[PDB]
Design a protein around this ligand. Sequence first.
Ligand SMILES: O=C(O)c1ccc(C(=O)O)cc1
Length: 302
Amino acid sequence: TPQALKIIVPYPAGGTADILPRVVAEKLRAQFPAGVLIDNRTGAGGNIGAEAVFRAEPDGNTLLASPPGPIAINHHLYRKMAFDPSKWEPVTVLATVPNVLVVNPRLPVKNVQEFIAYAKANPGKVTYGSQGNGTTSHLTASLFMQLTGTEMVHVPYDGTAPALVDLVGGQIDVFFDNISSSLPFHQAGKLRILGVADEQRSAALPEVPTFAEQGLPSMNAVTWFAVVAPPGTPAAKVAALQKSFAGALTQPEVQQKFAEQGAEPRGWDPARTGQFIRAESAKWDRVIRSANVRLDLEHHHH
Ligand SMILES: O=C(O)c1ccc(C(=O)O)cc1
């Protein structure tokens, strides 16, 4: 008898991890008359909510919709975890979204090179927020520091939303967020985006140069928002779910809300999604080792 589709998002409401599945869910209600429920489950950089899905019954009624940390990245930083992301059953990728460098407006910097010089002038003093250990914002900051020889202080939060509160407030200095969540802040001059970590500019921010344009072509850091099912979820179930998500993503209300905030809808099939997750896991391993990425197991609140 009918069950609501339960989607855990392992980050606080407000950021891109929460908004993209919520936008999609509005057009899935069609194939799920009992409802599509988003359940935010915060902490440990995404791992609390991930654990909850990993142990859920593998019937495809409980899914994780997450950015890369608890899917492709975290397992490279934790020697002992409570779940094994290699055992997720991939469903789809909802979207890819480039990361950016975004700064508090009172920082006296107008581009990436001026920020490099400012961090060198203040070695070990500039703070970068992150969305949590092993999130793309954490690793993107690490990459930047390796490529530029800068030394900054990690201030981990539990997702984008609390990090942006403190960035706007001036309690931290910089953050390597994704463009979608930082965009409205930049548009209103509440934050300043200095560069886009992709090979082309974003159509959502056509006036902001890439990092490649500004002298750092290895700053390619495009995050993504995937859906995974518990270990053992049947292949035919993951296939049907992917088809439903793909259909929602082509609905003009969804497509259009993604595109307006610089998110590229994907809708990839399960096997393509698995291949992509493994490639991304290998890509971020290389960053972790090259940039000597370390955990910060102290907690921060906005
Ligand atoms: O690892 C990431 O890219 C990522 C992590 C958290 C959030 C969020 O809190 O919305 C978005 C993206």
